[PDB]
Amino acid sequence: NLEDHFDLAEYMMKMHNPMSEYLYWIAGFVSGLHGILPLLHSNYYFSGMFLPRDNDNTQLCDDSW
Amino acid sequence: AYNGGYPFHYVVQYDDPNYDCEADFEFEEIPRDEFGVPAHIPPELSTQIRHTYYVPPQYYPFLKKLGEDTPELKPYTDKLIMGDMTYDDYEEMFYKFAKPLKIYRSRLPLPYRTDEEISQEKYVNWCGRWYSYRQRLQGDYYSRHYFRDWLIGVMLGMYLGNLCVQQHRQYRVDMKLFYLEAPEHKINWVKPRGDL
Amino acid sequence: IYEGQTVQESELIPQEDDWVIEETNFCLGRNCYVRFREEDDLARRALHQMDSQLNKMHTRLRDGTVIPYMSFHPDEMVDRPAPIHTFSEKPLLKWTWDETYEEAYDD
Amino acid sequence: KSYYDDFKDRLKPGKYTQGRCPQSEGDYRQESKTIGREHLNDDGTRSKRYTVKEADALGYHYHPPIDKKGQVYVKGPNTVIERGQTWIKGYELPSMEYTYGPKQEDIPFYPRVKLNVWGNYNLVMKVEFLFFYLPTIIVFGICIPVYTINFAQEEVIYTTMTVKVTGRQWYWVYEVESPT
Amino acid sequence: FYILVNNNKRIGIYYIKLSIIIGILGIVLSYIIRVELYNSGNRIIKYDNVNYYNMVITLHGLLMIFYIIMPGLYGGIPLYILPILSVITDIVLPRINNISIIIVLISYIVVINSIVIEYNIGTGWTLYPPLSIIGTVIVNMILYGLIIIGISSIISAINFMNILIVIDGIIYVYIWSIIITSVLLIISLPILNGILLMILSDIYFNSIYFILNGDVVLYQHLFWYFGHPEVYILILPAFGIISIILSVLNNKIIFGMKSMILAIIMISILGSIVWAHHIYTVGLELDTKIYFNNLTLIISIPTGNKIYNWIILYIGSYNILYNGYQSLIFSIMFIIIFIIGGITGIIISIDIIDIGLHDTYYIVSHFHYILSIGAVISLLAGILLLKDIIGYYNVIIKINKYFGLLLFININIIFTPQFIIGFNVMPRRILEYSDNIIVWNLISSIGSISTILILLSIF
Amino acid sequence: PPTRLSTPLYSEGGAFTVNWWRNRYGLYSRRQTDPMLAEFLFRQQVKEWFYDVPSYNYAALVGLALGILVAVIWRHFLFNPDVYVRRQELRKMWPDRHRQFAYAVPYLNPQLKNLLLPYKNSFIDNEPDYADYNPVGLRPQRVMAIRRIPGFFWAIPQYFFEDPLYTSCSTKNMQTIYKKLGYSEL
Amino acid sequence: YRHWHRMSEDDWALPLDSMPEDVKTLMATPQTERGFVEDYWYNRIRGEATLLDPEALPSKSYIALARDMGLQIVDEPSSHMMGLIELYEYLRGASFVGPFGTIENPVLVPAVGQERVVACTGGVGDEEHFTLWFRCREGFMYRCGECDQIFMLVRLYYEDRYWTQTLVRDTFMSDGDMFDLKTLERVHKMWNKDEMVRWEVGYWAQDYVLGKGVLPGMVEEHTRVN
Ligand SMILES: CCCCCCCCCCCCCCCCCC(=O)OC[C@H](COP(=O)([O-])OCC(O)COP(=O)([O-])OC[C@@H](COC(=O)CCCCCCCCCCCCCCCCC)OC(=O)CCCCCCCCCCCCCCCCC)OC(=O)CCCCCCCCCCCCCCCCC
Ligand SMILES: CCCCCCCCCCCCCCCCCC(=O)OC[C@H](COP(=O)([O-])OCC(O)COP(=O)([O-])OC[C@@H](COC(=O)CCCCCCCCCCCCCCCCC)OC(=O)CCCCCCCCCCCCCCCCC)OC(=O)CCCCCCCCCCCCCCCCC
Ligand SMILES: CCCCCCCCCCCCCCCCCC(=O)OC[C@H](COP(=O)([O-])OCC(O)COP(=O)([O-])OC[C@@H](COC(=O)CCCCCCCCCCCCCCCCC)OC(=O)CCCCCCCCCCCCCCCCC)OC(=O)CCCCCCCCCCCCCCCCC
Ligand code: HEA
Ligand code: HEA
Ligand SMILES: CCCCCCCC/C=C/CCCCCCCC(=O)OC[C@H](COP(=O)(O)OCCN)OC(=O)CCCCCCC/C=C/CCCCCCCC
Ligand SMILES: CCCCCCCC/C=C\CCCCCCCC(=O)OC[C@H](COP(=O)(O)OCCN)OC(=O)CCCCCCC/C=C/CCCCCCCC
Ligand SMILES: CCCCCCCC/C=C\CCCCCCCC(=O)OC[C@H](COP(=O)(O)OCCN)OC(=O)CCCCCCC/C=C/CCCCCCCC
Ligand SMILES: CCCCCCCC/C=C\CCCCCCCC(=O)O[C@H](COC(=O)CCCCCCC/C=C/CCCCCCCC)COP(=O)(O)OCCN
Ligand SMILES: [O-][O-]
Ligand SMILES: [Cu+2]
Ligand SMILES: [K+]
Ligand SMILES: [Zn+2]
């Protein structure tokens, strides 16, 4: 059939449902979260803070904020 | 000369009409070959024995007719009539009269070209030759030009490289004077800190 | 190394004094993204795509012969985008030699 | 000139985002009921039944195409007989304006030219030779310095003092000979 | 269907799609590093959570090599065009091709799941024992991923080697690059599997290979015996792509085709016997060091021939053709970038120079110029060349001079300072550093944040 | 390279020749299905690979690299004291391995080390002969070279007698300076 | 051809169990209406009936003899079609090497469809250039842009069908006088008598003509257990 000639015919003929693209981008977004979420979780687990304040592990001036 | 001499397909004969090599599990029947040689006569002996094809004599007039209409075929037909045709003789006859198929270019439809276009064939060939002539000459011209230009990069690289040679040259001179003359070099100066 | 086809002097002699190299344009034309019609369904858009293939185009010379789209590699010979089944008939790589046999000729 | 204005009419701006109305207004997920379109959805995409649930490669809707005589329909060429010869007229693709849109006029001229090839075999062979051995000479120039510096590292020296260093997680331990 | 498809061209797309998805996690991990290295003192990682940083660098290295670049260059483009470059219709082993991509995905899911569930610790992408064998279960999970990835790599290598049987045309330079890469995998992978099993034995079976009286340096030999062929397995497919792009986009026959083919073959032979330049600082014998140093320099000879052959492909091309296409720019950029990376490789091949530059950011910059710029740009260039054949759209990358210029400027900002930092000196795999290295680290960090912003412009 | 199959190809006798290559080239080939086609494909490969001038350069390189590779492997087994293949010495404690110790000193003094060590002064600027003297005698006493290493060492003069500061930076002069202060013995 | 596998047992002969049971209609079916199995047995029954009648062979012309055995007399049209079929089959797994193509003698590129991918490698020796691939479509005389070699596409097409061995036979072979079942019976009695069956195809064929299971031993021959 003519519809079956091209692989991924709907996408190549520009008729595909946009949800397919959204899932691909969402999948990539979820992959990225695997680096950020465990960072926050691990920081809180060992320190009790999600993120440090810059240079908070060093001596700071009295007025430092 | 293939498969160690074992043919892929060959005929086997059995003396008992109701014999089945898959159903029966008896141990007395001896299978025969296509020529009828019993299996317990080894091939190195049976292949030496001369086997010839015997057709019923009623076929002789027909075999005679084939030889006369095609004289090149007569010697093989005579062997068959006289019972002197072996399998090899039959094979020689078979392949001797096999001919290849013929393709006729005059029967091929041609792509459409007008009469005026057909008269310009020499011109287009003439243009093609000049393109090749121009192509071949330009290759020599370009090869000389660009490979020569590469020398500029070599000279440019040598000059810029020589700048760092001079810097290194001056650096070694400076280092030789550090321990001898430089006031930056100090002795009896650093004292141990001690454990905190 | 390859340096073009060899040419003999006699092959360069023209049959007329006004012959000059033909000025035929080998720019296939102006193109862009293939623009489909909203009315065409999936099947008819496939036909539209198959009719926009640059590798099916050629330039017709003055003698009726055509110089086609050509590429160094066969990657440019399949329909764009590549279909599921590309080379149904095996592409033929034509070699040339000087050998000949009598059966091909007739006197 | 502006070539976009030539085919502006063909390009009518769209109404819905991504080309579909909300599924409530029109259910594009259902298979089309139009005769001859049972393999397509309403929006024109192939239906899951045709491609997945009842795919022919899995044994559904078995229908051998080849006929008894081992033949399949083949469309013949456009044949013409003229000047005592049977000719075939090739199919020319439609104008690129129809498929792409721009009007095929004022095309820049690009002449026929044969392949750009490097000539002068004798000169070219020397260049290839240099490409190989100029890097080789550089390598040879480095080799001798490399041997010398390696030998300097492993030279046997008349040391008079030993310091033992042990690496531990995560600190360094030093052992030295105490003077008598 | 979507998962059951055996079409090689579809599977090639899946390899490219999966590499991009995994690329995001790799980019995230890379972004975490440069943010932390912006200045001395903790910025986004607690001092009490330094273990996480070690995991970030370990995964960044592993994911980018085995899950991103290798599938992209050895699985994605080859599965799409290799059967087309050959006159054959489809890949020889269709079912094996399907399982290979599925295997890659499952191993990725195992790795990322281990981040979420296991305690986060790191030992580097090289997994040197004894540190690797005294760690927690996350190290066990990472080993399973590598072994599983090894299965996909070897079966894919078997698939490409079978093309020699069925190829109905000429073996083009690109086909040679894939074939020789397959040969390297076949000879190097089994050695890797053997040593990885020994790591598991110590971790999980109470083996004592990596305790006193057992030479830990034994691991380094077997690992790097696969390690260096791996870097050559990554780059060789990139060389094949560059050869096609330069010839096609310039309408020039590839010059010295046989010299190119022999150069690829020579590199593989040399690349299999020079692994110990990764082990200069361990204290090898004098004669051993001289041998590896001498043979390592020889690898430049065949690699140099390819560079020059590429240059003459671009020289003399017609001026009328537009030269601003992204694929052409990337191909040309590769020559400029690769030379930088290779030259720095020759500098660190001299073992006495390497004594100062081992385990420093000079080595980081060395392999980033080759991989993060060169290999990525080659993969980008190949995908761009095949845009019409592949048929993807909804991006502005084909003619985008801003993207090429900004990418080139900013990636150079990231990694040029790292050469300078190497002499300063800053060790690798380090979170904190002395205050006097901040300026150069700050400049590279500004480069990293800038590059990520540029990627958003393609859409 | 002939272009007609009628003209034979010259072949020598031995294990790597045209005849030897023809016999084995088509063993695994599905394309060489008849004499005419087989010869055409054979000559096509021979013309493309063996008549390519630049290809011979790579043949030289593989030979050199393999020759070095085999020699270094063989040398380690034959001469390296630390490499054991026989088991007599491994069945004894370290102090009793007299036969193995015989390899130590000769393996410590290869010819090339003696030749190239004196050229350390092409790299070190101050006290290039700091380690030349060793009274123990396991190695020869080193004497600094009189010329720079050939090649890329344009930074230093061609011969060290052209350098006005070379003698002042020698270990002997520095030892004189520091001894005069009582700073150190060396 | 080299790319074909081993000959099967069927490539030599078919089992008698494949003989159509309605022999009377089989011998009356026109050739264009006979399937592969029906055509095989029509030729074997009719061919062996004439060959097993020695007394009539010498008086039978080659045209009649060829017709009885089902062999097609060769003519320029049929020879042309068959020749191009074999060339197409050979090129499936063989190299494509031949003389340089010119306008007078274009390179012939057989194809079933309207298009086939071809590569030009130029002439011999120095004239050989890098492969230049192009799509050879019907109805155009293609000219290589580098060496000026001329290519042309030849289509194996005929009346909505592509050339095949069976198609050639049907188009050109003409059915002769209808086969007479009396000849089958006459030859059957010649070689099959008193439990000796030296003409077994005729023995089965005659049994089917008489119905099925009429001749001695045929009921036992047709009874099977599975
Ligand atoms: C490196 C980056 C930069 C790169 C730059 C360079 C790039 C150069 C270009 C490269 C191009 C390469 C070649 C491309 C070829 C494309 C071919 C193609 O399109 O094929 C057609 C193919 C399919 O089209 P089709 O043929 O129409 O398919 C029809 C379907 O088969 C059938 O239709 P259907 O509707 O029936 O579909 C079924 C559908 C059914 O759909 C639905 O039912 C959808 C329902 C809606 C769901 C939406 C998601 C909801 C999420 C909720 C999250 C909540 C979070 C709450 C948080 C709370 C916190 C407090 O789905 C399913 O049933 C299964 C879905 C499974 C997959 C999706 C998984 C998502 C992630 C899951 C994560 C799970 C995490 C768990 C972790 C737990 C750990 C313990 O297209 C796609 O799949 C989309 C591809 C899109 C990209 C195309 C290329 C464009 C160019 C590149 C753009 C840039 C991309 C950058 C990367 C992404 C960044 C983020
Ligand atoms: C002696 C003892 C005996 C004991 C007996 C005990 C027996 C025990 C049994 C054990 C075995 C159980 C399993 C049996 C499997 C059977 C297979 C079979 O025959 O299937 C036929 C069956 C045919 O289906 P059907 O019934 O005809 O209906 C199919 C549909 O009608 C339409 O057909 P379709 O095929 O087109 O539809 C399928 C597809 C259609 O939907 C789509 O494709 C959606 C459109 C695409 C959107 C873009 C996706 C992204 C781009 C991916 C590019 C690379 C793709 C590579 C190829 C696909 C790989 C899956 O949707 C899906 O199935 C999901 C697709 C998922 C794609 C994943 C791509 C990468 C995701 C990256 C995630 C990043 C975030 C990280 C965090 C999360 C990590 C998990 O196969 C399928 O189609 C379904 C397969 C479902 C099973 C998949 C299992 C996956 C497991 C993964 C590991 C999870 C472990 C860790 C969990 C962690 C969670 C966080
Ligand atoms: C004292 C001891 C003395 C011992 C004496 C021992 C004597 C032994 C005699 C051996 C004679 C061999 C005869 C057969 C020749 C080859 C013919 C052939 O293959 O027919 C095609 C045949 C297909 O038949 P076809 O239809 O005729 O093919 C048409 C073409 O495809 C269509 O292509 P085309 O027409 O366009 O082009 C034709 C040709 C185009 O190619 C050629 O003509 C290549 C010609 C040169 C080949 C090399 C010859 C040796 C050169 C001297 C080396 C000396 C080193 C000395 C070191 C000493 C150190 C101490 O194509 C091929 O050859 C395709 C196959 C190439 C496979 C290459 C695999 C990688 C190996 C490395 C490459 C060679 C580098 C040599 C050194 C380079 C630096 C100087 O191929 C196959 O059947 C494919 C099977 C694939 C199996 C793969 C899996 C095997 C297991 C792998 C294990 C790991 C291997 C590790 C390798 C490491 C490499 C670095
Ligand atoms: C694709 C990836 C890739 C590629 C191609 C290379 C190629 C090379 N690499 Fe690299 N390398 C890595 C990836 C790569 N490397 C990685 C990832 C590491 C670190 C691993 C880790 O520790 O985690 C590493 C580490 C590494 C080290 C240090 C190992 C250590 O101690 O930690 C060295 C040392 O010599 C080295 C050398 C080389 C050389 C000599 C080449 C050669 O192939 C380069 C040759 C190219 C040229 C020289 C330029 C082109 C030629 C010319 C312009 C003309 C000729 C030039 C001369 C004669 C100088 N590499
Ligand atoms: C392919 C491999 C790869 C790639 C792309 C990168 C990319 C980058 N890497 Fe690197 N890196 C490694 C492999 C890679 N890296 C390895 C192996 C190590 C050693 C690990 C160890 O220490 O053990 C390392 C180490 C490493 C360190 C040292 C960690 C430490 O020692 O503390 C740092 C620090 O900044 C760093 C930074 C970066 C940055 C900023 C980028 C990038 O941001 C540069 C610019 C790139 C982009 C902006 C993204 C472009 C898009 C893609 C790359 C995906 C494209 C996908 C397709 C085309 C399908 N990397
Ligand atoms: C305290 C200070 C906090 C400051 C926070 C500042 C945040 C700054 C963020 C800057 C980065 C922004 C990134 C934007 C990414 C855009 C991605 C994108 O375009 O996706 C495209 C993609 C595909 O779309 P099209 O290609 O158009 O498809 C149609 C057919 N072509 O779109 C989608 O898939 C849409 C959905 C994608 C997921 C986006 C949302 C993900 C979830 C985010 C959660 C954020 C939580 C924040 C909590 C904060 C609490 C304080
Ligand atoms: C301590 C454990 C260490 C890890 C152990 C992992 C398992 C062992 C290594 C992987 C096993 C598989 C190796 C590859 C086998 C050969 C593949 C190949 O090319 O064969 C082709 C041929 C199929 O060809 P088609 O695609 O059908 O072609 C059709 C057209 N003619 O392959 C097969 O038949 C393969 C059949 C089995 C599947 C093998 C591939 C998938 C991977 C299997 C992994 C098994 C894991 C077992 C782990 C156990 C650990 C104790
Ligand atoms: C690995 C250990 C395996 C033990 C096997 C025992 C069976 C022995 C027979 C088979 C193995 C071959 C070795 C036989 C050796 C016989 C003579 C002997 O005993 O030699 C011992 C001697 C050293 O022993 P020691 O005296 O203790 O050490 C002194 C200081 N190094 O051993 C050797 O030198 C020989 C060992 C190596 C033999 C193999 C060849 C070496 C060169 C390999 C080159 C590889 C590169 C490629 C070559 C290409 C060639 C075409
Ligand atoms: C039926 C088929 C059988 C095939 C079997 C194949 C076996 C080999 C497979 C590959 C593994 C090689 C063995 C591993 C060798 C490691 C040696 C090593 O690490 O030793 C170095 C020293 O080694 C060297 O000097 C380096 C030599 C390089 C050895 C390379 C061998 C393998 C090469 C394979 C390359 C691919 C094949 C090429 C074939 C020919 C190409 C033309 C360590 O030295 P030190 O730590 O200082 O200790 C010295 C004394 N204390
Ligand atoms: O590894 O270079
Ligand atoms: Cu390396
Ligand atoms: K920090
Ligand atoms: Zn040509």
The pair of three-digit structure tokens given for residue D175, joined into one six-digit string: 């052992």
Rounded to an integer, what distance in angstroms lies between the CA atom of residue E51 and that of residue E62?
Answer: 17
CB contact under 8 A, C34 and D99: yes
Strand, coil or helix: what is D68? coil
The pair of three-digit structure tokens given for residue A17, joined into one six-digit string: 């449902």
Nearest CA to ligand 6 atom 34: A22
On whether the CB atoms of residues E132 and E123 are closer than 8 A, the answer is yes
Strand, coil or helix: what is D163? strand
On whether the CB atoms of residues E59 and E118 are closer than 8 A, the answer is no
Query: What residue type is assigned to position E267 of the chain?
Result: I
Give the Cα-Cα-Cα angle F144, F150, F151 (nearest 5 degrees).
140
Q: Which residue from D110, D116, D150 is facing E316, i.e. has the nearest CB? A: D116
- The values of phi and psi at residue B140, to 5°, are -65, -45
Count of C-beta atoms within a 10 Å radius of residue B57? 9
On whether the CB atoms of residues G222 and G213 are closer than 8 A, the answer is yes
3-state helix vs strand vs coil in chain A, percent to 5:
55, 0, 45
- Alpha helices (H) in E315-437, listed in sequence order: 326-347, 351-357, 361-368, 376-385, 387-390, 401-422
CA-wise closest residue to D75 among E223, G155, G152: G155
Query: What residue type is assigned to position E196 of the chain?
Result: L
Count of C-beta atoms within a 10 Å radius of residue E131? 17
Block residue for tokens 């049987």: E165
Rounded to an integer, what distance in angstroms lies between the CA atom of residue B74 and that of residue B68?
Answer: 7
Rounded to an integer, what distance in angstroms lies between the CA atom of residue B120 and that of residue C63?
Answer: 5
CA-wise closest residue to E57 among E21, E22, E34, E29: E29
- Alpha helices (H) in chain B, listed in sequence order: 43-46, 60-69, 74-81, 87-96, 115-118, 121-176, 178-181
Strand, coil or helix: what is F107? helix
Count of C-beta atoms within a 10 Å radius of residue B36? 10
> What distance lies between CA D122 and its chain's CA centroid?
38
Query: What residue type is assigned to position B159 of the chain?
Result: Y
Strand, coil or helix: what is D172? strand
Q: Sort strands B110-111 and D163-168 into parallel, antiparallel or unpaired.
A: unpaired
For chain B, positions 82-141, list CB contacts with chain G under 8 A.
100-105, 107-108, 110-113, 121, 124-125, 128
Hey, which of A8, A31, A36 would you mutate to test ligand 2's pocket, going by the most ligand atoms within 8 Å of its Cβ? A31
The pair of three-digit structure tokens given for residue E250, joined into one six-digit string: 């310039």
The pair of three-digit structure tokens given for residue B39, joined into one six-digit string: 């299996």
CA distances from C8 to B132, C98, D122, G124 (A): 11, 19, 22, 16
Neighbours of chain D (3+ CB pairs under 8 A): A, B, C, E, F, G
Beginning with the edge strand found earlier in the chain, give each strand of the sheet holding C92-96 in spatial order: G96-98, C92-96, G115-122, G128-137
**Ligand 4 neighbour E234 (Cβ under 6 A):** yes
**Ligand 8 neighbour F70 (Cβ under 6 A):** yes
Block residue for tokens 């579809």: E10
Rounded to an integer, what distance in angstroms lies between the CA atom of residue B48 and that of residue B39?
Answer: 15
- Alpha helices (H) in chain G, listed in sequence order: 23-26, 36-51, 62-69, 76-92, 165-172, 181-191, 200-209, 218-222
Query: What residue type is assigned to position D2 of the chain?
Result: S
Hey, which of F85, F87, F107 would you mutate to test ligand 8's pocket, going by the most ligand atoms within 8 Å of its Cβ? F85
Rounded to an integer, what distance in angstroms lies between the CA atom of residue E397 and that of residue E383?
Answer: 10
Rounded to an integer, what distance in angstroms lies between the CA atom of residue B176 and that of residue B185?
Answer: 12
On whether the CB atoms of residues E112 and E26 are closer than 8 A, the answer is no
Rounded to an integer, what distance in angstroms lies between the CA atom of residue G48 and that of residue G210?
Answer: 19
Burial class (CB in 10 A: 0-12, 13-18, 19+), B108: middle
Rounded to an integer, what distance in angstroms lies between the CA atom of residue F6 and that of residue C81?
Answer: 47
Strand, coil or helix: what is F85? coil
CA-wise closest residue to E431 among E29, E50, E48: E50
Letter string b/e over residues B5-34, b meaning 16 or more CB atoms within 10 A of that residue's CB: eeeeeeeeeeeeeeeeeeeeeeeeeeebbe
Residues in a beta bridge with G118? C92, G134
Query: What residue type is assigned to position E115 of the chain?
Result: I
CA-wise closest residue to B17 among G52, G217, G190: G217
Block residue for tokens 């005026």: B116
**What is the sign of the dihedral through the CA atoms of C87, C90, C92 and C93?**
positive
Q: Sort strands G107-111 and C66-68 into parallel, antiparallel or unpaired.
A: unpaired
> Around E439, how many Cα atoms within 13 Å sit in the side-chain half-sphere?
3
Count of C-beta atoms within a 10 Å radius of residue G163? 21
Block residue for tokens 């030992």: E123
- Residue C16 is given by DSSP the state S
Rounded to an integer, what distance in angstroms lies between the CA atom of residue A28 and that of residue A22?
Answer: 10
- Residue D49 is given by DSSP the state I
CA distances from E304 to D78, D128, E169 (A): 56, 11, 29
Resolution in angstroms comes to 2.2
CB contact under 8 A, F117 and D149: no
On whether the CB atoms of residues F11 and F19 are closer than 8 A, the answer is yes
User: How many residues are present in chain B?
Assistant: 196
D139–chain C nearest CA distance, Å: 29
On whether the CB atoms of residues A27 and C104 are closer than 8 A, the answer is no
Residues in a beta bridge with B111? D88
Rounded to an integer, what distance in angstroms lies between the CA atom of residue G181 and that of residue G159?
Answer: 35
Strand, coil or helix: what is G181? helix
Count of C-beta atoms within a 10 Å radius of residue F28? 9
The reply to whether omega before E130 is within 30° of 0 (cis) is yes
Q: Which residue from C28, C37, C51 is facing D94, i.e. has the nearest CB? A: C51
Letter string b/e over residues E342-357, b meaning 16 or more CB atoms within 10 A of that residue's CB: bebbbebbbbbbbeeb
CA-wise closest residue to G158 among G51, G97, G77, G89: G77
On whether the CB atoms of residues D54 and D69 are closer than 8 A, the answer is no
Q: Sort strands D163-168 and G150-155 into parallel, antiparallel or unpaired.
A: unpaired
- Residue A6 is given by DSSP the state B
Give the CA diameter of chain B: 132
Strand, coil or helix: what is B52? coil
CA dihedral angle for residue E12, residue E14, residue E15, residue E19, rounded to 10 degrees: 150
The pair of three-digit structure tokens given for residue F11, joined into one six-digit string: 């072949």
Residues with a CB atom less than 6 Å from ligand 1: A 8, 10-11, 16-17, 19-21, 23-30; E 2, 13, 16, 20, 23-24, 116, 383, 390, 392, 394-395, 455, 458-459
CB contact under 8 A, G125 and F41: no
Give the CA diameter of chain A: 78
What Rg do the C-alpha atoms of chain G give, in angstroms? Answer: 25
Rounded to an integer, what distance in angstroms lies between the CA atom of residue G140 and that of residue D74?
Answer: 19
Helix (H) or strand (E) holding D148: helix D121-153
On whether the CB atoms of residues G44 and G71 are closer than 8 A, the answer is no
The pair of three-digit structure tokens given for residue G81, joined into one six-digit string: 């079609």
Q: Sort strands D163-168 and G196-197 into parallel, antiparallel or unpaired.
A: unpaired
What chain C residue is nearest to E252 in terms of C-alpha separation?
C72
Rounded to an integer, what distance in angstroms lies between the CA atom of residue A2 and that of residue G56?
Answer: 59
Letter string b/e over residues B114-128, b meaning 16 or more CB atoms within 10 A of that residue's CB: eeebeebbebbebbb
Residues in a beta bridge with G197? G192
**Ligand 6 neighbour A18 (Cβ under 6 A):** yes
Count of C-beta atoms within a 10 Å radius of residue D69? 15
Angle between the N-to-C axes of helices D121-153 and B121-176, in degrees from 0 to 180, rounded to the nearest 10 = 20
User: How many residues are present in chain A?
Assistant: 65
Helix (H) or strand (E) holding D82: strand D78-82
Residues 6+ apart with CB under 8 A from E97: E6, E8, E11, E79, E91, E156, E159
CA-wise closest residue to G120 among G96, G89, G93, G86: G96
Rounded to an integer, what distance in angstroms lies between the CA atom of residue C44 and that of residue C37?
Answer: 9
Count of C-beta atoms within a 10 Å radius of residue E293? 24
Termini Cα distance of chain A: 70
On whether the CB atoms of residues F94 and F113 are closer than 8 A, the answer is no
The pair of three-digit structure tokens given for residue D50, joined into one six-digit string: 């045709």
3-state helix vs strand vs coil in chain G, percent to 5:
40, 20, 40
DSSP E57-104: HHHHHHIIIIIIIHIIIIIIHHHHHHHHHSS-SS-S-HHHHHHHHHHH
Burial class (CB in 10 A: 0-12, 13-18, 19+), F4: exposed
Rounded to an integer, what distance in angstroms lies between the CA atom of residue D165 and that of residue E7?
Answer: 60
Rounded to an integer, what distance in angstroms lies between the CA atom of residue G202 and that of residue G223?
Answer: 19
Count of C-beta atoms within a 10 Å radius of residue E104? 26
**What is the sign of the dihedral through the CA atoms of C43, C48, C51 and C53?**
negative
The pair of three-digit structure tokens given for residue C88, joined into one six-digit string: 């149904």
Rounded to an integer, what distance in angstroms lies between the CA atom of residue E308 and that of residue E315?
Answer: 11
CA dihedral angle for residue E80, residue E86, residue E87, residue E92, rounded to 10 degrees: -70
The reply to whether omega before F105 is within 30° of 0 (cis) is no
On whether the CB atoms of residues E58 and E125 are closer than 8 A, the answer is yes
CA-wise closest residue to E260 among E298, E307, E297: E307
Block residue for tokens 């912006």: E38
From start to end of G114-159, where are the E strands? Answer: 115-122, 128-137, 142-143, 150-155, 157-158
Say how many Å lie between the CA of residue D143 and the centre of ligand 8.
Answer: 29
Query: What residue type is assigned to position A38 of the chain?
Result: P
Experimental technique, in short, is cryo-EM
CA-wise closest residue to E360 among E423, E276, E434, E280: E423
**What is the sign of the dihedral through the CA atoms of E375, E380, E384 and E390?**
positive
Block residue for tokens 């160094």: C72
Rounded to an integer, what distance in angstroms lies between the CA atom of residue C14 and that of residue B112?
Answer: 26
On whether the CB atoms of residues C43 and D126 are closer than 8 A, the answer is no
Count of C-beta atoms within a 10 Å radius of residue B189? 6
Which chain D residues have a beta carbon less than 8 Å from that of E253? Answer: 115, 117
Strand, coil or helix: what is C33? coil
CA distances from G152 to C103, E273, G117, G118 (A): 22, 52, 12, 10
CA distances from C26 to C22, C58, D111, D113, E134 (A): 11, 8, 6, 9, 69
On whether the CB atoms of residues F88 and F99 are closer than 8 A, the answer is yes
On whether the CB atoms of residues E7 and C84 are closer than 8 A, the answer is yes
Give the CA diameter of chain E: 70
Mutate which: D150, D153, D166, D170, vs E, most E CBs within 10 A: D150
SS3 assignment for E130-177: CHHHHCCHHHHHHHHHHHHHHHHHHHHHHHHHCHHHHCCCCCCHHHHH
Rounded to an integer, what distance in angstroms lies between the CA atom of residue E70 and that of residue E234?
Answer: 6
